[PDB]
Amino acid sequence: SSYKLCVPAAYMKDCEQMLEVPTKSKVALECVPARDRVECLSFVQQRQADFVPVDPEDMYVASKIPNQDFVVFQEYRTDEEPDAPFRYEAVIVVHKDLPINNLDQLKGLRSCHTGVNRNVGYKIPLTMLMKRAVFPKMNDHSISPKENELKALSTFFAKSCIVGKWSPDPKTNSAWKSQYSHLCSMCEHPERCDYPDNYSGYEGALRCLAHNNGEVAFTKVIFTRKFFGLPVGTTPASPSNENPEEFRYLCVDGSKAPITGKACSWAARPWQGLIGHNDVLAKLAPLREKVKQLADSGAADKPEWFTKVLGLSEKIHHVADNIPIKPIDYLNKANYTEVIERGHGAPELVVRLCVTSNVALSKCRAMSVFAFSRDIRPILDCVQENSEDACLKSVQDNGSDLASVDDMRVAAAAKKYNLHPVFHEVYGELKTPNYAVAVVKKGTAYNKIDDLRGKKSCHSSYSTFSGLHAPLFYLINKRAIQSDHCVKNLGEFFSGGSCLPGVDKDDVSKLKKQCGSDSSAWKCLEEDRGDVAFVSSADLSHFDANQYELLCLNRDAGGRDVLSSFATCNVAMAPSRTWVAAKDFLSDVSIAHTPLSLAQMLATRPDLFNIYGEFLKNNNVIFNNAAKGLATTEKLDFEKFKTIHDVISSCGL
Ligand SMILES: *[C@@H]1O[C@H](CO)[C@@H](O[C@@H]2O[C@H](CO)[C@@H](O)[C@H](O)[C@H]2NC(C)=O)[C@H](O)[C@H]1NC(C)=O
Ligand SMILES: [Fe+3]
């Protein structure tokens, strides 16, 4: 008989400290952990929890749960605008003398935007304008949905300022900034088209309009009012050099309205707040008093539970009780469901990820609904086969658009299904694939590969890339050993003997000769049973940084570098879990976009959706828990992986 608050598992301890905050309300709250907020909504519907903080995007996810009976019973507002129904209203701001009497006439104007993927300055304008025949269509399927929007904007407006990361892929973003440079010509620094830019953001858009001869600005009321020194909410009038009489809101009417009056606004971003199941009603006043009290006492400096558990913020923690409202009706009255459901015209593009298990299917579906609610496009669809090979076949057949493959199966999958890598996992704090490296003791006499001829080697297991593939390819490639009888010949290069676990299962007896009492590469190196250890960079924790170095077999100069420099002192880059796609359908940009937008949106917000976390007590579902990001696969890395595999297929290994 408590009010159960769902909380991302990572923040359970913070919710517990919160439960110790003294308050006048004696309401008992309990912390219910979930995998993330998306799961929390399921637990709320299922009554394992009673409420959870939500952004409007989360309410939308919540409104789609089959048979849902959610209720938004609490709004988080600002102290500046405690009585405003919406977080912020989107407005169109023009010079008073702009000849215009219809929103069709926004065409050809120089436009001032807050920045890409933002609400009043981008998503809302796109949502509303696209309803207008004069606005370019966005269903050209030779390119991605994101490119369709940018093409549409750069074709409708004469010039714009739309800064920021248009693509999560750096090279795609740069290429797009070149091809649609008109979208950056109104900015303070057009070549860069990124933050900081004095002509971007809520205020910079009005400066773009007032000071850089822009002709329309998409922004929000509060920055429009303050730009002109006008009062807003609790904020009083301010001295301003800008004169509001020279400017006007442009209304959907096509009419103009004074800035000094109530703004005409085509949509608003709704406030965040709390969502709960319908049985929270009736039991509703005591909870609201409890949350209000926690909000007003965490205001002072702001413990973790303030933001991570209650979903408040420094700027947004005025708890306002509303007339309880269903989530979609909450979103509707802001015109914000339209924005959340924005598309690009039929057929809406879909990227179909192939998964190999029921749990992965369910993770892909929860990820899809989240991505969609968060304005990431293409829509993610989920397709299930019963193996990796069947997912790969399906990508070939165009039953799917992408599928993952691990370790050294990427080159095989390309030979066999004519697929190619699109993006791969990166790891560590440096967000980097693993590398196969060559570990040596400090001060030993090896600086290049021929110096190790006749010597002894330690390896990771024969079944590993770094242990077997990379040293075998590295030697064969430099012709230090013939490519007939490769494993034997490897043994003949390290003629002093080697430990390559599992080489047993031609005459390969030399390659287990040094395994001694303990075949681990770090014990084998430590005990001078080998003079170099071919291991993965992922295993370098087993080597004392003060005693061991990397042999930079990759560098022209050879030599040595520290354990942490593996990314440039190595044998080969290691294939990480990789998603592959066919040749004749979605572009690599269209395929990479949604997963890399997820990875980058969720890198700091695993509480919203735990993309790399445990999923129903299963690890490494879709992504490995160790993944720290996603990057597009360079063609040259692809091509190198194919050559390595070709050498290994030659050896019959
Ligand atoms: C949501 O969108 C509708 C359609 O643009 C807006 O409807 C207008 O509402 C005004 C009141 O400001 C009415 O007087 C007009 O008749 C409506 N105009 C049109 C063109 O339909 C409404 O303003 C929007 N609501 C929000 C909160 O953004
Ligand atoms: Fe915004």
Summed up, what is this model?
Belongs to the transferrin family. GO terms for molecular function: metal ion binding. The protein is an alpha+beta fold.
Structural description of this entry:
The protein has 653 residues and is of the alpha+beta class. Among the domains are: 86-269, Periplasmic binding protein-like II (D-Maltodextrin-Binding Protein, domain 2, 3-Layer(aba) Sandwich); 435-573, D-Maltodextrin-Binding Protein, domain 2, CATH 3.40.190. Helix content is 31%, strand content 19%. It is built from 20 helices and 26 strands. Strands 5, 6, 7, 8, 9, 10 and 11 form a seven-stranded mixed sheet that branches. Helix 15 crosses helix 20 and helix 16 (465-477) crosses helix 20. The longest helix is centred in the middle third of the chain and has 16 residues, at 358-373. The protein binds a molecule of 2 linked components (NAG-NAG) and fe (iii) ion.
The CATH architecture name of the domain at 86-269 reads: 3-Layer(aba) Sandwich
SS content category: alpha+beta
Q: Could you describe the largest sheet, including whether it forms a barrel?
A: 7 strands, mixed
Helix content: 25-40%
How widely separated are the two ends? 63 Å
Tell me the number of strands: 26
Q: List ligands, each type once.
A: a molecule of 2 linked components (NAG-NAG), fe (iii) ion
**Rough outline:** globular
